[PDB]
Design a protein around this nucleic acid. Structure first.
Ligand SMILES: [Mg+2]
Ligand SMILES: [Mg+2]
Ligand SMILES: [Mg+2]
Ligand SMILES: [Mg+2]
Ligand SMILES: [Mg+2]
Ligand SMILES: [Mg+2]
Ligand SMILES: [Mg+2]
Ligand SMILES: [Mg+2]
Ligand SMILES: [Mg+2]
Ligand SMILES: [Mg+2]
Ligand SMILES: [Mg+2]
Ligand SMILES: [Mg+2]
Ligand code: NA
Ligand code: NA
Lengths: 66, 236, 76, 116, 50, 136, 177
RNA sequence: UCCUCCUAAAGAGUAACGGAGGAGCACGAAGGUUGGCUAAUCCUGGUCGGACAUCAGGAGGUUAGUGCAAUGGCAUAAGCCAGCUUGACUGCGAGCGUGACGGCGCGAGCAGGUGCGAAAGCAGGUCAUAGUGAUCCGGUGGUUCUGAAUGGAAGGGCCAUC
RNA sequence: UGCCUGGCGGCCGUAGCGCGGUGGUCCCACCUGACCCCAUGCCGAACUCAGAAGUGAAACGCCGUAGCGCCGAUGGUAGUGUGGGGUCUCCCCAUGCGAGAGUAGGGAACUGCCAGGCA
RNA sequence: GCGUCGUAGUCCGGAUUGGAGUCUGCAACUCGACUCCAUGAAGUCGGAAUCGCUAGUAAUCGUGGAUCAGAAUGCCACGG
RNA sequence: CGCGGGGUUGAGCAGCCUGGUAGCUCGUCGGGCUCAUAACCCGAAGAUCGUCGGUCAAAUCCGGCCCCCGCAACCA
């Protein structure tokens, strides 16, 4: 590369709540701990818990406990 | 920005350079919407006060407590910070056809024209400028931050009568707070509402009012001392 | 009447034609663009005028991938 | 493209040299071989031709296609040229930047009896 | 017209100078180039003058 | 008035009117009006003739106007000396050489078409004839 | 990097059986990542552009190249030679590193994240997506940032068809709908 | 007064109070070399962002651009981007073009020094064609060419320039 | 001699686009690596160096085919030099030259200096 | 009386809006009151002008009653 | 039409002046003072700068279109 015109690149390591210790090549120099990560990835969760809108008759029928 | 009650109070301030103490145990609090004129001899710490206010320095004791709503805009004591190899318009705006003052933008050419720099006089290099024109341009360039705690360090450097009175009438309308450092008390006689008088030993005293009221204070608590000159001369 | 002005004629064109024996330095064509490009043994002035570079015969040719007319001088 | 944008890079020099009517020594570089030959002012018939694909020159070189190989060819083309009555030529860049193993090629020829 | 005539005096001390036109408004910096001085027969530096 | 909008030059030379015509074949409809003589047609006359054919059929068939003036004719004012510039543009004209097909129709029986064109030929300066489409 | 060897070992072997080409290197390969932040608002002040450039320098270990206006247009009150965007290009191994850390620790951090739209292909297997906030990248601590201006990421592949490019990003476990 | 097109009749030239437009400059880089690059417009995808800003890839093929009118040119680019630069040199000039003349234009090559390039080579301003004013009189530098008895000087002369 | 490949030309679409098939012994490109002189107004994309395992996928080169581009007669027509004649702002006769467009039709180039596979 | 907040659109302000509800009533959609959770807007003392009050008065705080199935920031009283 | 000038809030006018910066007095609308109206006080609103168009930038330059306002039409 062109040298000495870039922020310094390294192989720093951060840690998550589910473990997730990876020597990720990043330019920080003082790692920042993180929240949930790819081992808690909301790609099998977010869309599955998205579906909660629609359906209110059953909401009313509970009121007919009389 | 709108500014509230806290106007950067100062508590137990003490300054020194080695052993040369400039200010010791200074404490005050500027009110809101005021103009504060600073008077004193040469090399008595007046520029040092602005230096420590603007974060350039640190206080050897006490602390200055900024207000969180305060926007800072301090004018350097010296014109020698421009680059003489640039045009007036480029120097002020930054080579942008539209710059911004405060929050609204408005065109750079109009912004400069508001300082009586017409389109023809736009093209002169800032190295080819009279003293008054250089002062006006430097003031125009620095006042574009759109702040509200204007720390003017002798804006009356090389200003004519009419040039001086233009700013003298513009300052009285300022919403924000204005702290002004100057040596010509006649300029301050028209605008100053609070007074910072320097003295010996590093004594700085606060006062609330104009210079006629300062004279009233002296006369109410007077002291007989007028023997100022001695005329040292140069040759034996 | 608003118009009614014009410029003096510049007298361009071909001055020596094909098969004409020229001397070195003689002007072959006075030009505005480059309708005729400089072949071998001819030059090209700042006014795009094509002048002979050696005495001989004038020869117009159509060499080139874009069919652009060339003038070159045969050595005789 | 490589070749398409390179031949147009060398057209100007190639045409100017043709106008001057001088014999030119042209170099063609390849990631595996390198070639150099001298072509008459006719532009059609050639006089001297040396290349790394030739067996004898490539036998002594470890890997044909580096700086060492080109200088061996660069010296070699000079050897043949001086035996064909040729002393004065004009080196042709042919599009390749005159920095690496084309600089090595011509420099050996320059030091081996070619006046350019 | 805003370009005004200037003369490039020599720097070998002889009396010789070229002349040209220079925009004194947008180019306040003075000119100095290397030109031929046919009195001493050398390429000397020519500085800007009146 | 069947007149070009946004031309390139306002005034034009007089020119000449020799030669023959190119659009000499019935191409859009089945009957057409040729031009035996050589002359010129004003924009006023083209519309005056078209209104005459239309009032003959009055409902049926398309009409094509193969000709279009696009040429400005200028006139000097009344009681004006020669010179002092070129005259101002007054009307637009369409030069006609022999063989040019002026108008032509479709979908109309022959006898009605025959007399529809005749009522238009009485409005045109130049001698005109009747032509029927040929396969060729 | 990590995913470079993954591509070398798993993806190619899977795709040979999947799409059944007659040659190994007919498989598509992803070759460059271009990140652009089109500021536009830097017309008023230049400092915004430098802050965005420092932002991209933080996200990717490179100095951005700022890009000026190609054409002078009166609609947006700009003209040529006005620095209006910033750009970074990633190639090779250091491209792979950023690509890996993206799907490792930046996609899940997206607010209210559900997935990435699959019909965002320009018909030749090239992908792109905007983030709308730089804070998905963990190198910002609300200390130097003035605004929350986002970024656009583009992934350029040699896949001659979007169907071919499907199982390129799919094979790397991308969050698609 | 000068420049471009048409009238102008396929060499040149050619009138009218004939038809249409411009000039009285700019640039110490917008000049010289050495490297490198190639446009307008349309479509698809994409954060704020839309009809149009930046990014990606496809059609495209000069409809782009030229420091300023129009015509002729331009890809080897004469268009675009950087390095080092001052040949925007001094004395000449074979031979031609065009003018009634005054004059104006093109020019290989030679000598002395010079820049760029590894060299071959290119460079005596700008893609070209407008951006202008004779003589007289006078001003400022250089030059013992002359210097009215002689030596100096004034004043002339010659070169550069206003 | 034959077939194939690389470089330099000749002449510039009868020679260029499109679609189908096809080649890796050598040659050829992609590719492998890049701390090294060299380079990126960021990037081994380009320029450049050090190599060889796979690759003929994209390009390149070969053949094949009339969807294009392209070439294009003969006859006739328009025009026109010279000499005559008319109802003469337009034409005709004698003679010499004779287009443009369009029709038939032709059309997947031909070629010379080298070097390098092979048989 | 002891704590916290340290002058900020704030632990100020309590409008508007979404859910969950408790009651009275034959029935709370247009059109009730109250409660809980969330939301947290104008507003940093008000231009021209203008109003009340002379002692338990002005200012401030709370309680009560009439009307009434439910529904007072109004009215009528009471004290600090 | 031969020659000049002009077109800006609802009315009358500046600002065209060598481009970066839309104003004035009256009037319209809402409050206030008054028994009520005028007057007076306070607070607002609005103009594609005739039009088609062509200078980084115009109300400002230039060409055209539209309308209006003046001037000259002499010697026989
Ligand atoms: Mg002629
Ligand atoms: Mg002629
Ligand atoms: Mg130029
Ligand atoms: Mg070049
Ligand atoms: Mg150039
Ligand atoms: Mg030019
Ligand atoms: Mg004497
Ligand atoms: Mg003299
Ligand atoms: Mg507020
Ligand atoms: Mg407060
Ligand atoms: Mg009760
Ligand atoms: Mg009740
Ligand atoms: Na000081
Ligand atoms: Na001064």
């Amino acid at each position: 590369m062109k040298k000495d015109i870039h922020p310094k690149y390294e192989e720093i390591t951060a840690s998550c709540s589910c473990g997730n210790v990876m020597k990720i090549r990043s330019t920080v120099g003082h790692d920042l701990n993180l929240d949930v990560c790819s081992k808690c990835h909301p790609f099998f969760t977010g869309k599955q818990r998205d579906v909660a809108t629609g359906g209110r008759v059953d909401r009313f029928n509970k009121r007919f406990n009389i | 920005p709108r500014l509230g009650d806290k106007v950067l109070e100062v508590s137990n301030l003490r300054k020194s350079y080695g052993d040369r103490l400039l200010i010791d145990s200074l404490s005050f609090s500027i009110p809101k919407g005021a103009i504060v004129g600073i008077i004193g001899p040469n090399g008595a710490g007046k520029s040092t006060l602005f230096r420590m206010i603007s974060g350039q320095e640190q206080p050897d004791s006490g602390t200055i407590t900024l207000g969180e709503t305060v926007k800072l805009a301090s004018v350097d004591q010296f014109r020698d910070s421009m680059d003489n190899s640039k045009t007036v318009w480029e120097e002020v705006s930054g080579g942008l056809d539209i710059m911004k003052i405060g929050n609204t933008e408005m065109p750079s050419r109009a912004y400069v024209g508001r300082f009586n720099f017409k389109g023809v006089d736009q093209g002169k290099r800032v190295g080819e400028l009279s003293g008054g024109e250089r002062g006006r341009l430097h003031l125009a360039k620095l006042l574009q931050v759109g702040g509200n705690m204007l720390l003017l360090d002798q804006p009356t450097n090389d200003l004519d009568i009419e040039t001086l009175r233009a700013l003298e009438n513009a300052l009285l309308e300022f919403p924000g707070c204005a702290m002004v450092i100057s040596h010509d008390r006649w300029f301050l006689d028209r605008i100053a509402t609070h007074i910072l008088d320097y003295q010996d030993e590093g004594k700085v005293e606060f006062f609330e009012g104009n210079f006629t009221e300062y004279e009233e204070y002296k006369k109410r608590t007077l002291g007989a001392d007028a023997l100022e000159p001695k005329r040292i001369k140069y040759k034996r | 009447t608003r118009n009614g002005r014009d410029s003096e004629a510049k007298r361009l064109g071909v001055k020596r034609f094909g098969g004409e024996s020229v001397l070195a330095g003689s002007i072959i064509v006075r030009q505005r663009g480059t309708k005729f490009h400089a072949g071998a043994n001819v030059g090209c002035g700042r006014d795009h005028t094509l002048f002979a570079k050696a005495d001989g015969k004038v020869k117009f040719e159509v060499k080139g991938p874009k069919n652009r007319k060339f003038i070159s001088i045969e050595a005789e | 493209d490589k070749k398409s944008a390179r031949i147009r890079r060398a057209t100007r020099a190639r045409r100017k040299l043709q106008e001057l009517g001088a014999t030119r020594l042209v170099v063609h570089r390849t990631p595996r071989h390198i070639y150099a030959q001298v072509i008459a002012p006719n532009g059609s018939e050639v006089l001297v031709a040396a290349s790394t694909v030739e067996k004898a020159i490539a036998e002594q070189l470890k890997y044909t296609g580096n700086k060492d190989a080109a200088a061996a060819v660069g010296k070699a083309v000079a050897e043949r040229a001086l035996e064909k009555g040729i002393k004065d030529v004009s080196f042709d860049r042919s599009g390749f930047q005159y920095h690496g193993r084309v600089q090595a090629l011509a420099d050996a020829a320059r030091e081996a009896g070619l006046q350019f | 017209g805003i370009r005004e005539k200037i003369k490039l005096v020599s720097s070998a001390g002889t009396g010789h100078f070229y002349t040209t036109t220079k925009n004194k408004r947008t180019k306040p910096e003075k000119l100095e180039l290397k030109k031929f001085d046919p009195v001493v027969r050398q390429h000397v530096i020519y500085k800007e003058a009146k | 008035m069947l007149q070009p909008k946004r031309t390139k030059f306002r005034k034009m030379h007089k020119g000449r009117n020799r030669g023959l015509a190119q659009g000499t074949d019935v191409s859009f409809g089945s009957f057409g009006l040729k031009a035996v003589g050589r002359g010129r047609l004003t924009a006023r006359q083209i519309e005056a003739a078209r209104r005459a054919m239309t009032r003959a059929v009055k409902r049926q068939g398309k009409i094509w106007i193969r000709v279009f003036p696009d040429k400005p004719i200028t006139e000097k004012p009344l009681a004006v000396r020669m010179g002092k510039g070129k005259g101002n543009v007054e009307y637009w004209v369409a030069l006609i050489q022999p063989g040019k097909v002026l108008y032509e129709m479709d979908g109309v029986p022959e006898e009605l078409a025959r007399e529809a064109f005749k009522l238009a030929a009485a409005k045109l300066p130049i001698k005109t004839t009747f032509v029927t489409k040929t396969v060729m | 990097a990590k995913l470079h060897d993954y591509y070398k070992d798993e993806v190619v072997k899977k795709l040979m059986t999947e799409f059944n080409y007659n040659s190994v290197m007919q498989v598509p390969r992803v070759e460059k990542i271009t990140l652009n932040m089109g500021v536009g608002e830097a017309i008023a002040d230049k400092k915004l552009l430098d802050n965005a450039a420092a932002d991209l320098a933080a996200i990717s270990g490179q100095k951005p190249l700022i890009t000026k206006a190609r054409k002078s247009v009166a609609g947006f009150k700009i003209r040529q030679g006005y620095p209006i965007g910033c750009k970074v290009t990633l190639r090779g191994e250091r491209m792979w590193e950023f690509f890996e850390r993206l799907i490792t620790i930046a996609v899940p951090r997206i607010r209210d994240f559900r997935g990435l739209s699959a019909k965002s292909f320009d018909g030749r297997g090239n992908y792109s997506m905007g983030v709308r906030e730089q804070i998905i990248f963990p190198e910002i601590d609300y200390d130097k940032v003035d605004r929350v201006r986002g970024l656009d990421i583009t992934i350029t592949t040699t896949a001659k068809s979007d169907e071919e490019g499907r199982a390129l990003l799919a094979a790397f476990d991308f969050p698609f709908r």
